[PDB]
Amino acid sequence: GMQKLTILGATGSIGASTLKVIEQNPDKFSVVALAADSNVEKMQQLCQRWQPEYAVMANKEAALRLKMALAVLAPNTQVLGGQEALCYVATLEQVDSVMAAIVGAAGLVPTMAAVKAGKRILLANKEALVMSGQLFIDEVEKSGAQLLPVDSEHNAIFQCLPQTVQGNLGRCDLASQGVSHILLTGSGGPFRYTDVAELEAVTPEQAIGPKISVDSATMMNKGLEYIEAKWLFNASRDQLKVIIHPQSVIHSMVQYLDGSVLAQMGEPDMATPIALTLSYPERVKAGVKPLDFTQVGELTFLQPDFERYPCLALAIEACYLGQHATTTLNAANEVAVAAFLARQIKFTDIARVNDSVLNQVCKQGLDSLESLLELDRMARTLADEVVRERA
Amino acid sequence: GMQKLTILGATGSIGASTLKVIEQNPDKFSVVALAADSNVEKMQQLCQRWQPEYAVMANKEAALRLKMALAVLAPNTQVLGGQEALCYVATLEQVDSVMAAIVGAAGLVPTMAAVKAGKRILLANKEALVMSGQLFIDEVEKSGAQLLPVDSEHNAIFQCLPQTVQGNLGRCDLASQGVSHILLTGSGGPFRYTDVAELEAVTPEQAIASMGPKISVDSATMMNKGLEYIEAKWLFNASRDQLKVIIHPQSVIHSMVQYLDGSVLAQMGEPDMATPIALTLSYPERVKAGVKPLDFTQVGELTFLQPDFERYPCLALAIEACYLGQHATTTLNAANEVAVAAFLARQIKFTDIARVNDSVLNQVCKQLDSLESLLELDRMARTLADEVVRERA
Ligand SMILES: [Cl-]
Ligand SMILES: [Mn+2]
Numbered sequence A: 001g002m003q004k005l006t007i008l009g010a011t012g013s014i015g016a017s018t019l020k021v022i023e024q025n026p027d028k029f030s031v032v033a034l035a036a037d038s039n040v041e042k043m044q045q046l047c048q049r050w051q052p053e054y055a056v057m058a059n060k061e062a063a064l065r066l067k068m069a070l071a072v073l074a075p076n077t078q079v080l081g082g083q084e085a086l087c088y089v090a091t092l093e094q095v096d097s098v099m100a101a102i103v104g105a106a107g108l109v110p111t112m113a114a115v116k117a118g119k120r121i122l123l124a125n126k127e128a129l130v131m132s133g134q135l136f137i138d139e140v141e142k143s144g145a146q147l148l149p150v151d152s153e154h155n156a157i158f159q160c161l162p163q164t165v166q167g168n169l170g171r172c173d174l175a176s177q178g179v180s181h182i183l184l185t186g187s188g189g190p191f192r193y194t195d196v197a198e199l200e201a202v203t204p205e206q207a208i209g210p211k212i213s214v215d216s217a218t219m220m221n222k223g224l225e226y227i228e229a230k231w232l233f234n235a236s237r238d239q240l241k242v243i244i245h246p247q248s249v250i251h252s253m254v255q256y257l258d259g260s261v262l263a264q265m266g267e268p269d270m271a272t273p274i275a276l277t278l279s280y281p282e283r284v285k286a287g288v289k290p291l292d293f294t295q296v297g298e299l300t301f302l303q304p305d306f307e308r309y310p311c312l313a314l315a316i317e318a319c320y321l322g323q324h325a326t327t328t329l330n331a332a333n334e335v336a337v338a339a340f341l342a343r344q345i346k347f348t349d350i351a352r353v354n355d356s357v358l359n360q361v362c363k364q365g366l367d368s369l370e371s372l373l374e375l376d377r378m379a380r381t382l383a384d385e386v387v388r389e390r391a
Numbered sequence B: 001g002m003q004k005l006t007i008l009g010a011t012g013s014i015g016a017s018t019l020k021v022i023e024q025n026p027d028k029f030s031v032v033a034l035a036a037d038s039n040v041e042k043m044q045q046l047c048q049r050w051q052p053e054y055a056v057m058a059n060k061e062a063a064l065r066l067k068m069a070l071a072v073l074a075p076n077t078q079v080l081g082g083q084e085a086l087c088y089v090a091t092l093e094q095v096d097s098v099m100a101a102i103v104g105a106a107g108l109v110p111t112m113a114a115v116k117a118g119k120r121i122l123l124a125n126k127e128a129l130v131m132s133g134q135l136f137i138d139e140v141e142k143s144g145a146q147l148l149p150v151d152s153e154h155n156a157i158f159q160c161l162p163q164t165v166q167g168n169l170g171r172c173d174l175a176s177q178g179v180s181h182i183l184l185t186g187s188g189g190p191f192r193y194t195d196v197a198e199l200e201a202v203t204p205e206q207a208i209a210s211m212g213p214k215i216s217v218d219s220a221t222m223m224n225k226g227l228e229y230i231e232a233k234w235l236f237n238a239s240r241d242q243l244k245v246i247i248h249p250q251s252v253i254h255s256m257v258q259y260l261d262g263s264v265l266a267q268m269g270e271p272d273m274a275t276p277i278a279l280t281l282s283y284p285e286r287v288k289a290g291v292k293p294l295d296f297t298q299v300g301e302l303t304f305l306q307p308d309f310e311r312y313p314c315l316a317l318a319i320e321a322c323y324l325g326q327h328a329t330t331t332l333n334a335a336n337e338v339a340v341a342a343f344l345a346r347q348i349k350f351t352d353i354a355r356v357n358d359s360v361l362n363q364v365c366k367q368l369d370s371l372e373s374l375l376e377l378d379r380m381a382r383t384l385a386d387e388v389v390r391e392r393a
């Protein structure tokens, strides 16, 4: 059949890679809706090329401007505005799959909407599982929704697991299918070989979107992918290890009971993982060239040092404490990173802020997206506080 | 359900690795029969530990000595002798799987016997597919036999393929399951980085640089990789577009599969045949194999090289022979046995191996198949090669 898609977050690189896969397979995929935040210029250009039934801007004022643009550029496209409209396109009867690529907290509610409607979820929003993993997994089970991870690392892990595990994310019994270890890999960031002593003097210039680059330098991003992997693959602390792989040719790996390791590799292009999320359990052309082993260079590996990457230790800790600790850590880390970029704090202060905040909250019925959002707020003020003190 | 095994070639390193997996999983696997050639001392020790229902020595005189040893040490083990008995244990009703690990041409007939009986075949004999691939695949299809490859590279490829392909070896439609190509890897041998000019003066000492002496020379010339190439074609039903060769000097990666969407899967591991063998026993599940997990802190750097035919002319011959059919692959293999022995005996230079293979291959190709016709061919080609070696001096 023809697979029908809503793309939430169409104007970013995930959206672009998704559309490149769709362009390469026009007989298999079709765009019913596109959605974005406030980038009208990019949206109108997309809507012109794709002439979707719906187009949504989260920002109601941006929706108005798009509506007036598309009167000329895509006159059969119904433009809509606001949070309720994102849920509307995410839950349409005709839609099979939702690329859930709206970043941040704003992505929670419409991603959750697609989940409750039992859609196939191409998950590219970090926050669904970092903040509210237990809740997502539970709602996924309740509605029959299929969860297909888009992030390079989780997608790689998915490909290296056996089929029975792939079809059972959230609830999987890894040990009974022969899996010993999931090996989550990352480059280690620009300070992979920098002496721990020199981390205090690191400037924003050296550490480097800008927030995400700092999360790469501290490996707090990896910690976040760790938290997500735990929920996606139902993994204990011992089933889930982190390996530094500086060249990022290998994207992650799975260690089996019989000694066998499976690794996924590829050119650095999100169209590969996204293609598999669209096409699973089949494969499609993604407009990505085959890997050129002529150009790959040497592949090396390092065990991560927690003195160098104290944020990664915090995430892993937080991970097995539960939604409250992960929601807190993430909140605190947004604030600490902004504070570092503003020159209010040193590079190595980021982790201290994260650690201070994490300790305070953990001293204390059912969780909800709202209760956790309030928590995110609580933890944000606490972090704002700590930053003034360390200065 | 308890899986019941016959092990053909139990006294070698494949047999040992297989038994190590079985020892680790005594609740899943059980040894019905053990078979070997003429090493009675090793067999009696194995039969004492394992108390199999049957034990077979290919050599009838070795069978007699074993029979008398086992009358007390393993009193419920029926000892048997000869080629017919290898087939008998390979075709028993109670047996689910046959480890086909008798090497050389002698392994053909009993391996084929297990195939015709529709057994699960844990294939560890190179010759079945190098000499007689068309015939094996056809017989596999005809009886419902499952092929599970034991060689490290083919096993790796198998693990990197999707399930529908894995369950359809011999007949698989790779392109319809999203496979663009199979990437067969190898170390490139000790002349990895050696100037083509210096290959003429290479000595047996240098060519051998743990594995036997013939196989090490086939690793130096990449003729082994050509042989694995031939086998892969038949196992995975791979066209000329779908099968590639990559040098990977460290051999941490064992082989890989390139998919349509750009994704590559690779299989890696410690160099221990219990890993591949374990999967052949346990498929589609996994079992402990008594192999340690790979340690990435200790793996070192992983690199890749491009092979060139000036350095590895044998590889070009094998690939050529591959798509010419059983006659050419049977001939090449025969000729290469002789040329390698001739090199080790200091009769010919290292670089003469390929010439011998090439001379012989040309002669035969100027002119319905059976294991016997192909065995006769193997002998024809052997005499032709014996001839060419005298002339190169
Ligand atoms: Cl499972
Ligand atoms: Mn990443």
Ligand SMILES: [Mn+2]
Pocket (backbone or CB within 6 Å): B151, B152, B153
């Ligand atoms: Mn091999």
